[PDB]
PDB file of C-alpha atoms in Angstrom:
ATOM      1  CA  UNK X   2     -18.694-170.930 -46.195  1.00 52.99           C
ATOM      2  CA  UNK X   3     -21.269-168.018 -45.744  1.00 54.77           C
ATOM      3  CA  UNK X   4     -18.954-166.490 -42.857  1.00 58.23           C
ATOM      4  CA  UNK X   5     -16.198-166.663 -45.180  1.00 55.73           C
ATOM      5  CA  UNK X   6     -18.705-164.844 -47.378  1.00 55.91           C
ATOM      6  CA  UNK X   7     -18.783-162.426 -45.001  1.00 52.13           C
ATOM      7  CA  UNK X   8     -15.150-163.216 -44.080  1.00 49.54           C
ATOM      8  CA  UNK X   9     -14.119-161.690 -47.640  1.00 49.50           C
ATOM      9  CA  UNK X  10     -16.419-158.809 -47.229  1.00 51.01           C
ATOM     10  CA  UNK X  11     -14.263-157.661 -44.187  1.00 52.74           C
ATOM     11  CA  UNK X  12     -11.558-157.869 -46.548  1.00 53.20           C
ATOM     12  CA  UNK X  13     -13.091-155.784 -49.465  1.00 54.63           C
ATOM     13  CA  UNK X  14     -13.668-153.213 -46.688  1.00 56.30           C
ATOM     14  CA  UNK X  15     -10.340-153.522 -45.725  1.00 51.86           C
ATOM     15  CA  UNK X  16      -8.652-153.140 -49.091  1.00 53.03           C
ATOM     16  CA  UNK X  17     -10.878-150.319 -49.808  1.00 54.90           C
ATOM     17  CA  UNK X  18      -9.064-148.652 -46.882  1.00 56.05           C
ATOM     18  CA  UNK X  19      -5.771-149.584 -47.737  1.00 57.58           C
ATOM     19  CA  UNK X  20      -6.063-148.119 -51.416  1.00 56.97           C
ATOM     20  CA  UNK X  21      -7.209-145.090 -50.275  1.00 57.49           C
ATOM     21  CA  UNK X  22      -3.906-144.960 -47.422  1.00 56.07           C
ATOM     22  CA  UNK X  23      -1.622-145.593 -50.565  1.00 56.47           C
ATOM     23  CA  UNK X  24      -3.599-143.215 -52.821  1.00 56.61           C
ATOM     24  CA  UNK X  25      -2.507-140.634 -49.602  1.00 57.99           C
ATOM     25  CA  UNK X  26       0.981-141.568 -49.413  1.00 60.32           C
ATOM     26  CA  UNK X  27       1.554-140.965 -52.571  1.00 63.09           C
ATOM     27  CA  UNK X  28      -0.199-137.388 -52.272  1.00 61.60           C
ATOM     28  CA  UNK X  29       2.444-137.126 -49.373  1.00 63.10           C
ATOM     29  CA  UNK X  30       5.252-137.441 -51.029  1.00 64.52           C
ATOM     30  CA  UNK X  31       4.421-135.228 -53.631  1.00 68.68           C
ATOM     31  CA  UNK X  32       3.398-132.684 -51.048  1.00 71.50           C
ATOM     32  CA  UNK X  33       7.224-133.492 -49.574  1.00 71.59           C
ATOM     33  CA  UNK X  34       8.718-132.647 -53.223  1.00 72.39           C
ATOM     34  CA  UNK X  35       6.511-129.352 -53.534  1.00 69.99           C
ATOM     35  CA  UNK X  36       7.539-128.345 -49.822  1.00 71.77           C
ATOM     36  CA  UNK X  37      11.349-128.825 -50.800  1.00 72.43           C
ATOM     37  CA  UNK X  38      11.306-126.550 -53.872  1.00 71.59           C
ATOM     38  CA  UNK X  39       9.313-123.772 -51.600  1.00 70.54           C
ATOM     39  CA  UNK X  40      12.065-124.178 -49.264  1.00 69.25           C
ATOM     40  CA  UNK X  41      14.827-124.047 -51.294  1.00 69.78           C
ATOM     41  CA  UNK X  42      12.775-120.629 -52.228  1.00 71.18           C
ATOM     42  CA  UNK X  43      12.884-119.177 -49.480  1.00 74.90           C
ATOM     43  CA  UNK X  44      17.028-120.066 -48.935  1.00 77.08           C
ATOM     44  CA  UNK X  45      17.455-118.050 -52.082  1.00 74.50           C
ATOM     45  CA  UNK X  46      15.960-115.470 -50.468  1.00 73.86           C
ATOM     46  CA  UNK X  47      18.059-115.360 -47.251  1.00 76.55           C
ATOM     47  CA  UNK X  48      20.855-115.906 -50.055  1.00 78.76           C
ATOM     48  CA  UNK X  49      20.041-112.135 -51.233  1.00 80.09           C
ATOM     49  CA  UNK X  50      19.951-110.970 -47.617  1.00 79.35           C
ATOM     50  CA  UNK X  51      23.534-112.551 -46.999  1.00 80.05           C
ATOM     51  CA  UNK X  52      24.391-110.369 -50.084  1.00 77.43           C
ATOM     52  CA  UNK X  53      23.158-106.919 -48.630  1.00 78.51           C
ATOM     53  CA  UNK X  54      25.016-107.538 -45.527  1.00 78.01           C
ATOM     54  CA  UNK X  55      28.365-108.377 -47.677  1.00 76.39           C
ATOM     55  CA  UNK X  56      28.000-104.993 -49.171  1.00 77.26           C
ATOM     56  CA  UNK X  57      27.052-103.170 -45.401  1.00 76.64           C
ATOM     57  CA  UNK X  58      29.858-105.180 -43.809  1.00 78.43           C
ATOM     58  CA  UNK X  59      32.369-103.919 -46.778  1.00 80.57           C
ATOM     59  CA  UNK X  60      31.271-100.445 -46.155  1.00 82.38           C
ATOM     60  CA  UNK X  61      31.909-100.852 -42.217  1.00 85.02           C
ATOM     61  CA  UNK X  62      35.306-102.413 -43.169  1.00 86.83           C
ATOM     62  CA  UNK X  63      36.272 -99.938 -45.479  1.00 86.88           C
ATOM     63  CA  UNK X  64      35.630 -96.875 -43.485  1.00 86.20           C
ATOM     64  CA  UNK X  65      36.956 -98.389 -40.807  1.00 86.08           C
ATOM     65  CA  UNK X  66      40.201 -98.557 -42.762  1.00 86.26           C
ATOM     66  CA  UNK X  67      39.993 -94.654 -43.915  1.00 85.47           C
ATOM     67  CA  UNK X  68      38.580 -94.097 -40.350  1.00 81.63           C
ATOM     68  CA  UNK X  69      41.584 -95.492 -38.731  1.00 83.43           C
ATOM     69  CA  UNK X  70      44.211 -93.638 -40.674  1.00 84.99           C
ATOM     70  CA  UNK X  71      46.583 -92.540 -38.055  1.00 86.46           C
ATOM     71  CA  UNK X  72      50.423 -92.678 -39.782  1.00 84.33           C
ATOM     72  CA  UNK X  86      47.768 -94.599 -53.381  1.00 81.74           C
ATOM     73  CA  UNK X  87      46.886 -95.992 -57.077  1.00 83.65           C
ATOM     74  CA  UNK X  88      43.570 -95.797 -58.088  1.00 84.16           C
ATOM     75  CA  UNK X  89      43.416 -99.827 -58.678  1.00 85.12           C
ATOM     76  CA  UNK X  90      39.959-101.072 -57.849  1.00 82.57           C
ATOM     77  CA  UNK X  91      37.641-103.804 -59.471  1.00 79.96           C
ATOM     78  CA  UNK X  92      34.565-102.917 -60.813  1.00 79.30           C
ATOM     79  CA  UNK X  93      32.512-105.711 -61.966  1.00 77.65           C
TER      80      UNK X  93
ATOM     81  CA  UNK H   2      38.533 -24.077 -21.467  1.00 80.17           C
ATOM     82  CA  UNK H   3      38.098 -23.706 -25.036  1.00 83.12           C
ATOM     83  CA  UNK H   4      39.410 -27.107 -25.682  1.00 83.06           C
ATOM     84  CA  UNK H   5      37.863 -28.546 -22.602  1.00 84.33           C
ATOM     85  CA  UNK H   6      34.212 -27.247 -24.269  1.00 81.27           C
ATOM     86  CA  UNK H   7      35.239 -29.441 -27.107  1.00 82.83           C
ATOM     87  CA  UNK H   8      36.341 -32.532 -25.100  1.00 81.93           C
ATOM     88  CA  UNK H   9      32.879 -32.251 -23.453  1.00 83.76           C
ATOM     89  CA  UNK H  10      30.814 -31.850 -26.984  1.00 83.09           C
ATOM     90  CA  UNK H  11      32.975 -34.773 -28.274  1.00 82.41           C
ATOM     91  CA  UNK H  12      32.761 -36.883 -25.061  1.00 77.94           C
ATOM     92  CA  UNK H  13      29.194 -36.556 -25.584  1.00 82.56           C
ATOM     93  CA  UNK H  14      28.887 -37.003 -29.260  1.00 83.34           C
ATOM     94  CA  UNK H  15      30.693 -40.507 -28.217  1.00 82.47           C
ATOM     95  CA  UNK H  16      28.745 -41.738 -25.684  1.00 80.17           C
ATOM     96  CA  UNK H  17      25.555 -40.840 -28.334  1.00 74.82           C
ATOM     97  CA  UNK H  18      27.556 -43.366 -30.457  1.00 76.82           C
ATOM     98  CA  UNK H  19      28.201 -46.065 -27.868  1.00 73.37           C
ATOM     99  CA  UNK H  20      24.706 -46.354 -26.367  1.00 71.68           C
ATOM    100  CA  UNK H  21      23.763 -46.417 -30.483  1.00 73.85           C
ATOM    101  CA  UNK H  22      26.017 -49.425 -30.446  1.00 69.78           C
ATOM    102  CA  UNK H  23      24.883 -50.461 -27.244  1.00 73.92           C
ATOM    103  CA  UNK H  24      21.046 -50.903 -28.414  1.00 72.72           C
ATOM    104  CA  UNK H  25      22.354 -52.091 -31.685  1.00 75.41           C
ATOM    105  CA  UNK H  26      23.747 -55.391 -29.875  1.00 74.61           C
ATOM    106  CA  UNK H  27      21.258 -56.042 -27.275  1.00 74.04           C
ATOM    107  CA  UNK H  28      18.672 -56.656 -30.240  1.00 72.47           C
ATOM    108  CA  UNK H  29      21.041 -58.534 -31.944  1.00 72.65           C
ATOM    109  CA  UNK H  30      21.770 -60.688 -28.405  1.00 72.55           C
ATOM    110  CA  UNK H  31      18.011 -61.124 -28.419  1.00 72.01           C
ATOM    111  CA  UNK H  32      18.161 -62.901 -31.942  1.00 71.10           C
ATOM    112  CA  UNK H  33      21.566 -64.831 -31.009  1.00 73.82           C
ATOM    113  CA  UNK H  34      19.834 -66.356 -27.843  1.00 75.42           C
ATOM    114  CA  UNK H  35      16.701 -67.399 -30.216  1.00 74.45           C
ATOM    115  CA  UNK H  36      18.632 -68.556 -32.818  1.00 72.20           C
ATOM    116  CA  UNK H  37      20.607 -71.186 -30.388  1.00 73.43           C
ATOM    117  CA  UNK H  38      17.340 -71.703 -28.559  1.00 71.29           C
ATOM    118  CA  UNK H  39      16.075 -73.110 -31.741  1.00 70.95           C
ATOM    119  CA  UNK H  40      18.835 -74.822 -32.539  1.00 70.08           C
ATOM    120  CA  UNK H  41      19.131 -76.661 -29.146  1.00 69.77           C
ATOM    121  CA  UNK H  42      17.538 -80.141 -30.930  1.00 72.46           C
ATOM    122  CA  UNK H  43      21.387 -81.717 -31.512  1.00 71.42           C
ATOM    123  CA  UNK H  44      22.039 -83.254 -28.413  1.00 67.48           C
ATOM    124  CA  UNK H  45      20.664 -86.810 -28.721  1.00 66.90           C
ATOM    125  CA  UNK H  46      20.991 -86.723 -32.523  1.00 66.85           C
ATOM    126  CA  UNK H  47      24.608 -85.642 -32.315  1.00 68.05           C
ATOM    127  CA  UNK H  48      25.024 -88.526 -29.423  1.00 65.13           C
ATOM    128  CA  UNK H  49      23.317 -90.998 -31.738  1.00 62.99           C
ATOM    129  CA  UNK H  50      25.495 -90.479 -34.854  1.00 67.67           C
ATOM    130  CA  UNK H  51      28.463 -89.919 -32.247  1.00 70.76           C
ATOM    131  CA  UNK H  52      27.518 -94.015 -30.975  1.00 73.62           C
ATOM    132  CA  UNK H  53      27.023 -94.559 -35.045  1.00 76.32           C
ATOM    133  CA  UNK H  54      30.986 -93.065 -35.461  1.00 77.46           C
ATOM    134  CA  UNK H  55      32.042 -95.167 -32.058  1.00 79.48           C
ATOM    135  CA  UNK H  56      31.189 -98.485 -33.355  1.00 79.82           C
ATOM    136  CA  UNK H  57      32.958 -97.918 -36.357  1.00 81.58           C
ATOM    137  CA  UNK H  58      36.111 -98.364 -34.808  1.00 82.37           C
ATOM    138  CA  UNK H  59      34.362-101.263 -32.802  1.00 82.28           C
ATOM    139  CA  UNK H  60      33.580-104.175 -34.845  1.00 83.03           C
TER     140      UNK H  60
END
């Protein structure tokens, strides 16, 4: 009986412990959701570089084209 | 000789001319030489653009 006394008061200890290892998961996760929208950040910025090289590479392209003349309308699109 | 005193004067009168001339050019030579002298700095810059114009028709 009195070591199960003492028995229980391993236990308290022990749930003590294990509240405070759930209350941290938790914090994990949440520190998991936060890290994913930063990420998804930072993607949107590489997203903008992807768009400065689609306007260098059309430049390189189009030159290229003019550059290469060796042997019209005025169509274009302008957004 | 009458006409061969002239040739002489005249002969004379354009050689005057032509070393005028002469001294006339060789300063100007002197600021030709500068001027390309200073202008001299459009060898690697001319290569670099000249790569730049290469790999245009490159890619």
């Amino acid at each position: 009986s009195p070591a199960l006394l003492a028995r229980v008061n391993e236990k308290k200890a022990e749930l003590e412990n294990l509240k405070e290892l759930r209350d941290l998961s938790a914090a994990v996760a949440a520190q998991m959701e936060a890290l994913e929208q930063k990420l998804s950040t930072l993607s949107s910025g590489t997203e903008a570089i992807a768009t400065v090289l689609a306007n260098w590479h059309n430049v390189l392209r189009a030159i290229s084209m003019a550059s290469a003349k060796i042997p019209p309308q005025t169509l274009v699109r302008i957004p | 000789s009458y006409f061969e005193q002239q040739r002489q004067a005249l002969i004379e009168e354009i050689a005057m001319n032509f070393e005028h001339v002469l001294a006339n050019i060789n300063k100007l030579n002197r600021s030709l030489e500068a001027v390309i002298a200073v202008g001299n700095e459009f060898s690697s810059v001319e290569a670099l653009w000249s790569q730049f114009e290469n790999v245009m028709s490159w890619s």
